[PDB]
Design a protein around this ligand. Sequence first.
Ligand SMILES: [Zn+2]
Ligand SMILES: [Zn+2]
Lengths: 219, 219
Amino acid sequence: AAKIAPSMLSSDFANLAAEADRMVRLGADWLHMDIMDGHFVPNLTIGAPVIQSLRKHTKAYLDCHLMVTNPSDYVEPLAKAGASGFTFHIEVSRDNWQELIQSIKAKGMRPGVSLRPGTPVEEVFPLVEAENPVELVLVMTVEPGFGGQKFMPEMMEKVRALRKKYPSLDIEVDGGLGPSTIDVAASAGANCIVAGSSIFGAAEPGEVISALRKSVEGS
Amino acid sequence: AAKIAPSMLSSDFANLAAEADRMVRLGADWLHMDIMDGHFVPNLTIGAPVIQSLRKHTKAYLDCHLMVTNPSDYVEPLAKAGASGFTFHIEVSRDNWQELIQSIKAKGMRPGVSLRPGTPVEEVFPLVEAENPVELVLVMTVEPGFGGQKFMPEMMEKVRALRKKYPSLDIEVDGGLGPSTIDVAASAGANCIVAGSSIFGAAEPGEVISALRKSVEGS
Ligand SMILES: [Zn+2]
Ligand SMILES: [Zn+2]
């Protein structure tokens, strides 16, 4: 199924409640929340508290991308906060993915995993195949850090690879996605698109979302 | 001079723009922003991005309290974001306070320093006396982590001590400040008060602010 989740990171943070409600109105399936602690990536954005306050205003799906080092330590707070999706990083999740995916799941959150550009795609299959597996895989399409970097087409090799072995797994692409790049990723197998400036900086935001969706469905 | 800065951390994060504008209306002199990376304290709140979006909505003074480990790395972003005051922690700022205070200053922000409960007050005098010194000292009145902890009167010893040697230095108290405790701190020497639940959870928020101020001036 197609899923177009705007990256609230490129929105008016002073007006999350507003922005969030406006994206659904325009077609937002999910709301992509990037939580960074400045240690895993040279940048600190938002944490649990935020997520929580936002849940008191919208019932939308909150896709939480955990770019932190101590993810296990966020599972409890984010759950309470009301996160819908919890996605961790294979890099720091080495050696507990099995326990982690279970903690996440047992909290009512859809567990997911992600891998930076330079991380062999193979590394997730084990996590995608486990008894209690992740239900989504996020493929970083740029070096994780700040919004506005150049889309990396090479990363598409990972999308196709995934899509082949797993025909119905939600595959998410995050970084640079927009009209100009949606197609190359749509054909690769991505069905969960995260858009940032391509939406919050468009004259026709609603339109843009409607275009990312078609792309994916026309695939 | 008295300064009553509400702690935006206890506000409706989904509506910062709103909340912030509402506090000025009621009397807020400054807006206390607590930036935590989860590594210096088991909690992650908000980072530069937020601060920035918020600057596009208000001209209020943004008092930034940096509870991070790598503070020097936030000086550049916060400056651009529009922070008015940059306050770092003596614990992690050991060995560069001189260079740090200068970086902060040279960016147009008022440099400040803070010390957890268990940190000998003496440790800041050097920083308060330097050629390019800090212009404010924050005295943690509770163990740094989450809003809602018990005020620690003992910590007042530090306020008095500071106020004595430095008669006109802005002294800030953060943690549990409210009507019930403003006086003990007002008499000690504190003139910059940071209030959280005592304001955002009051029936007469505006009134509360007016009460914290009198306390201080009646001193
Ligand atoms: Zn993301
Ligand atoms: Zn503070």
